[PDB]
Structure formats: C-alpha cells, structure tokens
Coordinates of C-alpha atoms in Angstrom, one line a residue:
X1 CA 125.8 27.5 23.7
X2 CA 126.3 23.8 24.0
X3 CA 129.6 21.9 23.2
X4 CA 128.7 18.0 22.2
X5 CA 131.0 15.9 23.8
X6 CA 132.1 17.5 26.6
X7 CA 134.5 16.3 29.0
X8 CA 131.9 14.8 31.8
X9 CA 133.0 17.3 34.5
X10 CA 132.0 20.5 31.9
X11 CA 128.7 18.5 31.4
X12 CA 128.6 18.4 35.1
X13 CA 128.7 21.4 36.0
X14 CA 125.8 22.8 34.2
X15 CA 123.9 19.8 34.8
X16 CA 121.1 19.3 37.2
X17 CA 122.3 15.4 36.7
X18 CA 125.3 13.1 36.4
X19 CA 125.9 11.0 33.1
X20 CA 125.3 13.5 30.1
X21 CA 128.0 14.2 27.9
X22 CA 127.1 18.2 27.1
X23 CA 128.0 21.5 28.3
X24 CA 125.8 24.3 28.0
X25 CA 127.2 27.8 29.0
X26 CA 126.3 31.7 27.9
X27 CA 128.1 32.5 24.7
X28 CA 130.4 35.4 26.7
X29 CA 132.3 32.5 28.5
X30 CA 134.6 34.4 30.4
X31 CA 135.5 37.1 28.0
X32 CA 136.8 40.1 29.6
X33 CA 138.1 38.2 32.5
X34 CA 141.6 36.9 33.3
X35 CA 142.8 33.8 35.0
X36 CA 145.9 33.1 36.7
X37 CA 147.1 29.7 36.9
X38 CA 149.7 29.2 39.6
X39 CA 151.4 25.8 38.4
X40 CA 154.0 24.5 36.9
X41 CA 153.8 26.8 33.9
X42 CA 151.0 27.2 30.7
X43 CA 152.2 25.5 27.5
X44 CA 150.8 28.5 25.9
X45 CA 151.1 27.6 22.1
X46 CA 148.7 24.8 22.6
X47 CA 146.2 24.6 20.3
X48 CA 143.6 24.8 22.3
X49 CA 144.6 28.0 24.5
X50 CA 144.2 30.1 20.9
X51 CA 146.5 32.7 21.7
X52 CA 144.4 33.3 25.1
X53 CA 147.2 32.2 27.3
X54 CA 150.6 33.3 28.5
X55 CA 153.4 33.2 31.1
X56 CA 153.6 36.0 33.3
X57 CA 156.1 34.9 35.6
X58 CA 158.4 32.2 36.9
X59 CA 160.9 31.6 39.7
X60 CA 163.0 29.0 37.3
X61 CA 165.3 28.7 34.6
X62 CA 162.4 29.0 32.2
X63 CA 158.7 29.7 31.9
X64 CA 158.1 26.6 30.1
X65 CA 155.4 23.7 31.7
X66 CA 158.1 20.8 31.6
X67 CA 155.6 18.4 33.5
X68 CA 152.3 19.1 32.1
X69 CA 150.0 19.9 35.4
X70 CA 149.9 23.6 34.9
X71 CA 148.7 22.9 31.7
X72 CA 146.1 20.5 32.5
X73 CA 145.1 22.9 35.0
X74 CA 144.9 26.1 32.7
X75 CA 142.8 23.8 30.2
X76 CA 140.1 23.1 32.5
X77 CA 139.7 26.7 33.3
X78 CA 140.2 28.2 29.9
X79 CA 140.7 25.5 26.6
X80 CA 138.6 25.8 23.8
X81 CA 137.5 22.0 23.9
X82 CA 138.8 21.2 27.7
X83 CA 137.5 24.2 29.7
X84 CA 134.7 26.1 31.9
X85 CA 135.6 30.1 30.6
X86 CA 136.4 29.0 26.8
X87 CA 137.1 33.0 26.3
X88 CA 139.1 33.9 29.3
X89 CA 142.2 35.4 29.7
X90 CA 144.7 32.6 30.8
X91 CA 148.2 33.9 32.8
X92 CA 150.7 31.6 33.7
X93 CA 152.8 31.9 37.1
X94 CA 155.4 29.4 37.8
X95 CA 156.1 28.6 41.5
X96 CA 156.9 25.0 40.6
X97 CA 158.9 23.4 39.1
X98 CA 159.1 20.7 36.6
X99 CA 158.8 17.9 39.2
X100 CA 155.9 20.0 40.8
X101 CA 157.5 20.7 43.5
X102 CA 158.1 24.1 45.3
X103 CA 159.6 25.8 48.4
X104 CA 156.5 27.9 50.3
X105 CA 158.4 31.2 50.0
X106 CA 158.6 30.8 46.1
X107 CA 154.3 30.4 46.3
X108 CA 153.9 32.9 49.0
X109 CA 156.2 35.2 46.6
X110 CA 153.5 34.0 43.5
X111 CA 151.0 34.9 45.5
X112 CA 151.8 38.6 46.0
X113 CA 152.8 38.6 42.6
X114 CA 149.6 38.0 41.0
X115 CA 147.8 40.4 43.6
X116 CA 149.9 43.4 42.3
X117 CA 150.3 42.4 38.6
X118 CA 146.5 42.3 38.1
X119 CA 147.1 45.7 37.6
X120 CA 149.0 45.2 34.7
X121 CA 146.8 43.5 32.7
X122 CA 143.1 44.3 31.0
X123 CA 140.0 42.1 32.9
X124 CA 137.8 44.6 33.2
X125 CA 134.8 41.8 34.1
X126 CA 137.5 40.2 37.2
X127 CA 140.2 38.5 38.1
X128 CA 140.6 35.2 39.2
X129 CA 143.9 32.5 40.8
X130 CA 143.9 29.2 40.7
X131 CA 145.9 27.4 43.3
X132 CA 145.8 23.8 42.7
X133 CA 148.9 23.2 45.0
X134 CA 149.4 22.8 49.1
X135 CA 151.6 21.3 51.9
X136 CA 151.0 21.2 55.5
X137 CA 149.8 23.9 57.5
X138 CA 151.5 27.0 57.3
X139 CA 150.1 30.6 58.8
X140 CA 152.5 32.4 56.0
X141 CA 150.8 30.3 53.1
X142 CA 147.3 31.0 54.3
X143 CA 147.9 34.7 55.1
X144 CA 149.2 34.9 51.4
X145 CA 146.2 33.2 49.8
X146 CA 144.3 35.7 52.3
X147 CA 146.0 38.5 50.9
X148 CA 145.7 37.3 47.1
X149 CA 141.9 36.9 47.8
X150 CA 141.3 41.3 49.6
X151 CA 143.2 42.5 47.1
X152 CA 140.1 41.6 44.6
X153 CA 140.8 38.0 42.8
X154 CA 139.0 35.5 43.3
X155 CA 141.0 32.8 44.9
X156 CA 139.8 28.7 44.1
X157 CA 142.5 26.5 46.1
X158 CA 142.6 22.7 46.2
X159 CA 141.6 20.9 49.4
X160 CA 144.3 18.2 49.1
X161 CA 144.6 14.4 48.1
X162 CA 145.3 12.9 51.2
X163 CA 141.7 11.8 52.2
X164 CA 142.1 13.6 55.3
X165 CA 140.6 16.9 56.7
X166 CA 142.2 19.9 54.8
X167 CA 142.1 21.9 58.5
X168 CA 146.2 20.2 57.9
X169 CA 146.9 21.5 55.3
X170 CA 147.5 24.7 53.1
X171 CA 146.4 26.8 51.3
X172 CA 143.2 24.6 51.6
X173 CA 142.9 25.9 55.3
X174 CA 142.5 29.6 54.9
X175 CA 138.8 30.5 55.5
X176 CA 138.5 33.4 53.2
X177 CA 139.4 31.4 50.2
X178 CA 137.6 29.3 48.0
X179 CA 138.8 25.6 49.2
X180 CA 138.0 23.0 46.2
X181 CA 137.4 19.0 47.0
X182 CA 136.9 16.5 44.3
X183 CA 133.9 14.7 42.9
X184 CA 133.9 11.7 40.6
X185 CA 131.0 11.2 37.5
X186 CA 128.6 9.1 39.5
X187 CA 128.5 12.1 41.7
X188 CA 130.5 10.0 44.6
X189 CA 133.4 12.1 46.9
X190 CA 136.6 11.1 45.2
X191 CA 138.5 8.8 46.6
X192 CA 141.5 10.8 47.8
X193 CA 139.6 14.5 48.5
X194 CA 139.9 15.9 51.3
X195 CA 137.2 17.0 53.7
X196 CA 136.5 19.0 56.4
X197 CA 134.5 22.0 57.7
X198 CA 137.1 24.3 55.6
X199 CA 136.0 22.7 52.3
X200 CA 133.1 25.2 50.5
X201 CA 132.9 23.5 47.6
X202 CA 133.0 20.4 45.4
X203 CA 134.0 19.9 41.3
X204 CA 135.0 17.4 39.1
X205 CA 138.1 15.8 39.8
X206 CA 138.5 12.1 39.1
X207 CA 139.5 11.1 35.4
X208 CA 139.2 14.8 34.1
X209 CA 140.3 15.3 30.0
X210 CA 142.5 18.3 29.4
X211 CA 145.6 19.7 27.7
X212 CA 149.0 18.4 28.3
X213 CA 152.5 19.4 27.3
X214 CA 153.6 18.6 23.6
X215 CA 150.6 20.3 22.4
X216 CA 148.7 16.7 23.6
X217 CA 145.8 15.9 26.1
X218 CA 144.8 13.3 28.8
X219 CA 143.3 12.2 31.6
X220 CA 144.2 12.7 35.5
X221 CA 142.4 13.0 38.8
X222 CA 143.4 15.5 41.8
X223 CA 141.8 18.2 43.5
X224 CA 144.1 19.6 41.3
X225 CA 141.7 19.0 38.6
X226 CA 138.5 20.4 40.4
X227 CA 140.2 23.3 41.0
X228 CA 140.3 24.9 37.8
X229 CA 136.5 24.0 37.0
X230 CA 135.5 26.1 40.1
X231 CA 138.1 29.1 39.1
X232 CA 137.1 29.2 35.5
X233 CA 132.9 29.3 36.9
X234 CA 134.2 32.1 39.0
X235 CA 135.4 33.8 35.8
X236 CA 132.3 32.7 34.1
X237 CA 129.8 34.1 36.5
X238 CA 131.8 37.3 37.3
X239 CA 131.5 37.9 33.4
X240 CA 128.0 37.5 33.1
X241 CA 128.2 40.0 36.1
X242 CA 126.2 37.7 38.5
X243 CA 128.6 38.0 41.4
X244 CA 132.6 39.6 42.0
X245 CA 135.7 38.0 43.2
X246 CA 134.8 38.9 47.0
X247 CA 131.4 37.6 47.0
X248 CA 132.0 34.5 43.9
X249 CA 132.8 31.5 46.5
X250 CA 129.5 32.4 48.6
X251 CA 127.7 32.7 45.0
X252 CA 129.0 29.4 43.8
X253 CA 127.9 28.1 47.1
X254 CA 124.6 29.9 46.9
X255 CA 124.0 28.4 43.5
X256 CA 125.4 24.5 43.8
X257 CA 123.9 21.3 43.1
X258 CA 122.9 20.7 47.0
X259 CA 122.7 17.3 48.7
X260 CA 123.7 14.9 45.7
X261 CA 126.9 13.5 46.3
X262 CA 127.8 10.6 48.3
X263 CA 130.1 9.8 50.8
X264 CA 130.7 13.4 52.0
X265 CA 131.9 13.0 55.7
X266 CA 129.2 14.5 59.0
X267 CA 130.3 18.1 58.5
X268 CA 131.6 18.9 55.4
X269 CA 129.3 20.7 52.9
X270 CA 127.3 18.4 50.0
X271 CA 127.5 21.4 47.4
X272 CA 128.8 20.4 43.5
X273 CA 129.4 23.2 41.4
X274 CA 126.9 24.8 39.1
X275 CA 126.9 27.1 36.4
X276 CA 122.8 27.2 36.7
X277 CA 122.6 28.1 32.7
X278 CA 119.2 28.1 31.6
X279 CA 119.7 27.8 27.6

C-alpha cells in the first residue's frame, strides 16, 4: 500500500532515504494486534482512530485526553492518516494527567495493569505499550517496564528530551526495553534526544503531524513523538509475523537504516527505524 502525503516520519520509516513524502506498508497494517498507549488518555472519537481506539483505564476523574499528548501519541501509532499500524487496536491508559504530569507509583500501577489486562482483550498477532513518559532514575520504574516487557508486550519507551545520556533517567534506562531517541527529516539527531549506550533505536521525532484533542491535528517534537512510530512498527512487523514482542526490539534493530544519521554521540547506536517493505 502507499499513502501520498504522508507525514515525513511515516515516509521515513520505510524509506531507504530522507525527503520523500510517501509511506509504503503491507495492506494488514497491524490488524490483529493491539496497542496500549500509556499517556494522558486517547481522544477516542477522533476521526481518524475509526472506532479502533478506546480507554481502558485511568487513575483520574476521567478517561478523557484533556492535553492532547496521549492523542498525538496513539495517532502516530495507529491513525488512519497520522500512523505506522493504520489497523491496530489502540487502548488508552491514563497515568497522567491533564498537565502531563504523574506520580511514579500511578505509572508503575499502569504498568502492571496493561501486563494483566492483555488478557482481556483479542490480539491474537501481539501486544504492544508505548511509554512516551520518564523522570529520573528510579529501580521501581525500570523493574515495571521490565515486568511489562516478560510478561509478552512489546515495550517502546522514550529516551528523554534533556540532551543528556538516558543511563539518568527512566524508563529510558531499563535494558530489556525498547529505549526510543529522536531523529529530525534531514536524518540529523534531534536536538533535545537523548543518548547513550541504553538507547537501541532511533525514529522520527522533531516536527511530527498527528491527532490532537477537539478532534484536530498538529505538529510537535519529543521523543515522545518517536516513540509511537517504533511501537506501532513493532505491531506492524509482529502482524506480518516477522518477529514477537520478546525478540521485536532486536528485530527492529536487526532491520534499521544503519549509519545514516548525524550527530549521534561515540557510543550510542546510528540505527533509524525501518519497516524494510518491499512493495
């Protein structure tokens, strides 16, 4: 399939090149698998989530996205026009609130959450969590992603917007997740990724189009916003059965664009994500 007009990071990732404009993907695009989004909440009526997306959970006075990043987030992963896995499953769980902010127990309590209700819900091609959230280091928020990622999802985690090495921060320090920096269109590190020996992958992240509350859409930059590109490949590729949520971070690695970005710091790994569609 090929969508004219992409968003440049979808063109991206199944590009062997920076600065084309359309994304080419296999037609099953994530059906059968399910994504959780732990955010501020899905503004599942959207448009552009087409009845694919829902809250699951929340901590708060409501399950409503009243800031719009959970949302952004969820339509890189899953949007008909905005996302990676246009046919995915999308699940909401809000650990923070409206001003995107949250206490670690209330994520570490997400977490767990998504890790037993997977076993509620119908993905028989996988299940994957996107984390595009983190503080300082903590061994509890780590051991949480950790468990998240053996009980069988596939766990995509920001590295952090402080332009420092993630080893500081978390969940972006857990090894067994998949830790997610940010690349810009000219294929350049993005100014405020992180980096470090803990990072296993690179996606788009600076200026990236997606939903927003109020059934609307716009632009933003963050890790936040790679994030979701490399969860919704993981739901991608573990629905055309090329990989599973243990082994999709290694795969993704396995597979990337190698060696073409620039200003990645002595040590950290030059791999952009790839979806490696031949159409």
């Amino acid at each position: 399939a090929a969508q004219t007009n992409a968003p440049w990071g979808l063109a991206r990732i199944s590009s062997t090149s920076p600065g084309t404009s359309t994304y080419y993907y296999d037609e099953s695009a994530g059906q059968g698998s399910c994504v959780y989004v732990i955010d501020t909440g899905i503004e599942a009526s959207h448009p552009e989530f087409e009845g694919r997306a829902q809250m699951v959970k929340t901590y708060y006075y409501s399950s409503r996205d009243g800031n719009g990043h959970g949302t952004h987030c969820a339509g890189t992963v899953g949007s008909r026009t905005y996302g990676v896995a246009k046919k995915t499953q999308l699940f909401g769980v809000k650990v923070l609130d409206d001003n995107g902010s949250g206490q670690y127990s209330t994520i570490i309590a997400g977490m767990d959450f998504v890790a037993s209700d997977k076993n509620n819900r119908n993905c028989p091609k996988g299940v994957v969590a996107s984390l595009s959230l983190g503080g300082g280091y903590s061994s509890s928020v780590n051991s949480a992603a950790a468990r998240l990622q053996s009980s069988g999802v596939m766990v995509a985690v920001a590295a952090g917007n402080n332009n420092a090495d993630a080893r500081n921060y978390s969940p972006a320090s857990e090894p067994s997740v998949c830790t997610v920096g940010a690349s810009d269109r000219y294929d350049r590190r993005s100014s405020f990724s992180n980096y470090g020996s803990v990072l296993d992958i690179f996606g788009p992240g600076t200026d990236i189009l997606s939903t927003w509350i109020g059934g609307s859409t716009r632009s933003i930059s963050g890790t936040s916003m790679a994030t979701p590109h490399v969860a919704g490949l993981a739901a991608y590729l573990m629905t055309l059965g090329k990989t599973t949520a243990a082994s999709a971070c290694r795969y993704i690695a396995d597979t990337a664009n190698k060696g073409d970005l620039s200003n990645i710091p002595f040590g950290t790994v030059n791999l952009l994500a790839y979806n490696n569609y031949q159409a």
